[PDB]
Amino acid sequence: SVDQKAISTIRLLAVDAVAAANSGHPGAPLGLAPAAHAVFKKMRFNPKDTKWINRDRFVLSNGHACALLYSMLVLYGYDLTVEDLKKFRQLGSKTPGHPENTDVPGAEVTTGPLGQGICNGVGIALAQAQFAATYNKPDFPISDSYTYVFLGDGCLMEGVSSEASSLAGHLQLGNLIAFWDDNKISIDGSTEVAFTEDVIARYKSYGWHIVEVSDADTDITAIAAAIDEAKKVTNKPTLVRLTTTIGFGSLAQGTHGVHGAPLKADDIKQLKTKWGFNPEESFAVPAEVTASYNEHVAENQKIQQQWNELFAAYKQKYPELGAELQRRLDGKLPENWDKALPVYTPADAAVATRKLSEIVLSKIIPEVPEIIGGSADLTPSNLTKAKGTVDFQPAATGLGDYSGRYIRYGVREHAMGAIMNGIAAFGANYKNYGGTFLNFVSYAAGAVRLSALSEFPITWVATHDSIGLGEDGPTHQPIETLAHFRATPNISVWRPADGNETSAAYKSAIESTHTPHILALTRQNLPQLEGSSIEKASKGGYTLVQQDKADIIIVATGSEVSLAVDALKVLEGQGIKAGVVSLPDQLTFDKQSEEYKLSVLPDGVPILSVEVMSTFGWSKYSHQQFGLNRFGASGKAPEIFKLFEFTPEGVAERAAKTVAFYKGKDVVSPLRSAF
Amino acid sequence: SVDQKAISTIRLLAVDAVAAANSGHPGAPLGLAPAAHAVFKKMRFNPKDTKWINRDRFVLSNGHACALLYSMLVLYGYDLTVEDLKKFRQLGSKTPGHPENTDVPGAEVTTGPLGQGICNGVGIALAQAQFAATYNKPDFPISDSYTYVFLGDGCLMEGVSSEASSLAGHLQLGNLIAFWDDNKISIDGSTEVAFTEDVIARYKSYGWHIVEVSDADTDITAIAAAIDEAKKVTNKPTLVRLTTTIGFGSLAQGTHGVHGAPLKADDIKQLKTKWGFNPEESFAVPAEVTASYNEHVAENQKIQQQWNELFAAYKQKYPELGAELQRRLDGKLPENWDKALPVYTPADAAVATRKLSEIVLSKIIPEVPEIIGGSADLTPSNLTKAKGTVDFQPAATGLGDYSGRYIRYGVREHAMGAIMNGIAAFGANYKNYGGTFLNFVSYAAGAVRLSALSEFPITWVATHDSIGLGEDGPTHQPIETLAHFRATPNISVWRPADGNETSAAYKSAIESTHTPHILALTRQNLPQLEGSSIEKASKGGYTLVQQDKADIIIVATGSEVSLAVDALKVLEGQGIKAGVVSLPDQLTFDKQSEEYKLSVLPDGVPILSVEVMSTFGWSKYSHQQFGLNRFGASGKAPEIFKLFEFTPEGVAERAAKTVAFYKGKDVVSPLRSAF
């Protein structure tokens, strides 16, 4: 049959791609080709419009199996060809060794780090439910799409998937349909050596529906039926157990050796001959397969055409919601949304930047419907919920509704991070956020790094940023955390000092389209600064206090900017004139013009940095660095600052020593370099 | 009864401690006091010998509840007093806001970051099983202790606990007994908002035994019986469901408000009066409670005394094993163990540092019985198993035995990290290790940071360190990872260049008693260096190529040292004389004398760093930095190096530019500072 020929085509494209590269993973592609064929036949998608908002989404969580995904995309006529498959795993190709959403048409997210993709699927499904609840009306199913995820044993072992699966079950996400590749083989061999849990019983305990397909090497009828069954269960995510043979068809099927290395040439020949292909030929695409797949594309394109007419009719019947939806699909924020950002003066009261963040969210959430977010069980500590708003919950619970805007993530930082990536991946201009303590953003590093690589505009509301949190002590107090994330490409790490800087940080975070944000916020109160503004702070770094005859410039962030200003006054009594620079986001600053940056950090003057955590990175901006390179302490916060000499006098002492150290030396800006 | 009085005493000590600090968490201590009383009555321990190797261990995974732990330790006459309780959460006290094993007698591990403690308990239990299998003989139960863990809803939400619980069930760890504080309250309120899974069904799916105690606010008889029941189930870890009221007794019992803030003064008065205490008194310790607890201590001390005689008899009957055990309990490695470390010359073949690591392990595992370790499903990629050795598995599986030395962690990096901490915490000189790709050590950051804070000598065998891994691409290639961990206090981050440096890295890792190690190792082959030795590399940084008339010194690590040596030759053709420094561990280097360090990085010469990942930190050691501050690429590794100009010519170009940039300038060592 043509379906059998399609499955063989997929299998052999994947094996031939791995063969050409002499690198990659043929086993799971061989085992999952029947399921991929069946799923893609059920999916609604347009290869010529990868952003159709009502498409079904597919996520390959076992991203090492990407030769399978690329083969599907090629066969369906995405902007990916057999010539691209021939360049699998080659420098600069459109077929990298793990799927990259920035590079690969039809890759919704970036996978390869195990466990992430299923969580991303939870986020795509969460977004779809929220979106549908916001826009659908009687006779107007604007959003009714499904989220299909493939995953393997490795993903099921990674704790992040447990977090997301518990939450997805709680949230009754009935449009999520995941498929477990139950092949009992991982890199170390049989799953009997390390993974003997009853997976199905665990997924039932989360509130998932289960369908089991005992012969997923051949039984595409049962796979299709499992999808139909899953669609009938509207209040539970479904896990479909696909019992497969890893490397199905290979001489080495059912072994760890077929997981992650190219097949032998003779093995590939016998695959071809028993499936009716020419063993002398590679990258074969039978025209009957193309025809069958093209029929499904043409039908899907008619579905999208009808959706476009539905959307036009929606705009007539619901003019306000229709214009809102159009604006979001155009990727535009509301006109002048930023006029809602709070502005402060030096006459205003001291406020913790966590509370300033609450106030910003309170003002902008009503103005910008595409903002949703939550906290990892720290809502009253992070201050991440706007008063009055409704939680995102299934209405059946009585605790919220899917139209809600506030997500109770529970104590699940890593899954929160990966779910945020999925919400961003959904599209429709979602600007989504997640709160925890800064020190516990580190629990989610696997996902945060992928936010950066995937270019998703997600935001971490990361409170309790330093020893300023006080008594909870060194297990809670960041030291390395900002250095870690600043050292990651493409992360904006805002550490606002005051009200105006906090508004600038949110302006950046919400306007972002390609850069994740971490907002490092205080537990403790900070004063409003003389010289701050949204305008200046939007530059990432700016001159807060200009001193034309400066003996030293102090560059600082966050809570240490006020400290620097107080130190300036101590220094004045010692006959030393200081300027102050505030550097709320190093990435944004770095992106400014060379001349702007040199206006902030000029030649001819020593520069001291002050920030109460690691000194790593700070030599980009300073000659000397006053930081905290040891763990913290459990005590009242002001006492901890005093212990470590983060006081006006302690800063002044180090500033005076810096001036003395450079006496008789020629000093050029830290921004200068040899290459 | 005295038991009722003891429970009230515990409850009121905890509440009074929180009250004195005006900070901390009274709710879980109130709810868990009956269970704590019951468990500690069953436990064997000596308050005057916290290191008795056959003690039962207790771990408070819900570490915010530490006022409870501190109250138990005080009541039992550990080196912690009521005066210390009065200083709860005060700077410098022995009663920090979360328990610290370095600071608190009787705190086995450091908790506070949720999820960690249960995993640490899995590691303590794993170590106990391995230790017992290694040493016990007929009539010689040298090791027969239990591991008791308290945990809450937060720990159960964190994915790391799922990983460890799946693995513990697989490993049939019957001496692990965990207690879930089933109080249905977290920081965001009811667990109904985010955590509605069937926890008990999930734990059954992992292969745990379950006991449910429906009235754990009062029923200490049932808690004691649950422990007895758990002890009879020798092939399954047990979860005891303790249904409690958070804040039991408080006016505000059963609410999130009692989780994490001090009680009102009037609430504390009514607690005291209804439990028969004086509402005008704080920190009361009824002498009858002290007497009852002292009886149990005296009995436990007689048990330890008998154990000491058993150990003496063991040494007579089993002289070799007895001497081995004594040496380990003394904290000493085998005499001259390091003579087993492989040594190389420049005439030897190029070898990847992952393979050099395999060879080291092959030589030292037979010589040092206290080395055990594993991989997170990357055994044939990390090369972490010595040929011939047996896996740590329950013998019932046929896949290993508890005397085994190699752990199949599965795809569970975070739990592996926390389990390693527990194995270290067990004691007996365990030197344990865990393999994964360097980029996925980041999945385990929560635990790695705790290795550093807890001062545990654990080792990560972190292969595939850079773009040198090639085709798996940017989702696998570290950029930020070394900067992150080097910026964390107390982490030795070895990046050995060759065979001799790899042996030095292991010498450091195995000799360590207070510093965790990460060994960043290559996929790709590297040459043996002219000038390397174990002796010199043991200094952390050393002069590889001395040049008395140097125009520049190039400092490099790992794969980039050979690159620097090749660049030296290119530079010689351009009329530029270079020296080369190898810096295999920045922490070890930093600990050397000022004069040694200045001999390596002298004044009067420009210094360029070269390392194919973030430049953060490198200004400690260099004037200019050549690094990789963007994500990688999917292609053949040599092509990626060429793309980013990590070639002899590219390094030479930047070295020449560095020399030119400093022409006419006075240059002092990067090691100099103003303060």
Ligand SMILES: Cc1ncc(C[n+]2csc(CCOP(=O)(O)OP(=O)(O)O)c2C)c(N)n1
């Ligand atoms: C977070 C993370 N850890 C480790 C790896 C390395 N790795 C790649 S695939 C794999 C496991 C393979 O098992 P499974 O997911 O069952 O794939 P299959 O054997 O079915 O191909 C591992 C450990 C990774 N990609 N991501």
Ligand SMILES: Cc1ncc(C[n+]2csc(CCOP(=O)(O)OP(=O)(O)O)c2C)c(N)n1
């Ligand atoms: C990794 C991590 N994330 C977040 C927190 C902040 N936090 C402290 S306690 C807690 C949850 C409280 O719930 P539970 O563990 O059930 O404690 P109980 O309410 O019973 O006191 C949270 C989210 C933390 N300590 N560690």
Ligand SMILES: O=C[C@H](O)[C@H](O)COP(=O)(O)O
């Ligand atoms: O899963 C992917 C590969 O099998 C895995 O990353 C191992 O890579 P290696 O070929 O470097 O061992």
Ligand SMILES: O=C[C@H](O)[C@H](O)COP(=O)(O)O
């Ligand atoms: O669990 C501990 C505390 O309740 C938690 O860390 C919140 O701290 P906060 O008092 O800063 O909100």
Ligand SMILES: [Ca+2]
């Ligand atoms: Ca598998």
Ligand SMILES: [Ca+2]
């Ligand atoms: Ca709880």
